[PDB]
Design a protein around this nucleic acid. Structure first.
Lengths: 66, 66
DNA sequence: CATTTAAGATATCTTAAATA
DNA sequence: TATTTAAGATATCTTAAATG
């Protein structure tokens, strides 16, 4: 029952960086990162790809795990 | 420069399928496909990944090309 | 100080009508 | 009849305020 938001936060925690720092890498605000982690919203196409690169994983892993 | 929508339409033409057929494959309406092709909107995260699979290419190719 | 909540503008969809 | 346009619901973002 793992949500994409939980995978996003776990990968950020692995990097040990703040939401604002991850936001800067992706091109969005720290608030957008927070909304994605809490599963309030999901990243759009371009942001999902940028986020996957910053977190060093595939977009599929974030979307549905593995 | 070439827009993502143009790469989407060209790729669809290659597979020889109608917009409605691609929509069924991705899980959206034929109108959504029309909007992406004309650059009226861009696919969201889940939809871009499903679209890349239906068109047999990477999300990166659709987004930025070569 | 990092994050979440609040308020608000634009983006992304759906269905019905219009167009080629 | 394939695709585009129009209207409208709601998702995805923004910056400021509040909370931990």
């Amino acid at each position: 029952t793992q949500l994409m938001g939980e995978r996003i936060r776990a990968r950020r925690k692995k990097l040990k960086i703040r939401q604002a720092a991850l936001g800067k890498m992706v091109g969005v605000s720290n608030v957008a990162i927070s909304q994605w982690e809490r599963s309030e919203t999901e990243p759009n196409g371009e942001n999902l790809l940028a986020l996957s690169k910053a977190l060093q994983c595939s977009p599929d892993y974030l979307l549905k795990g593995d």
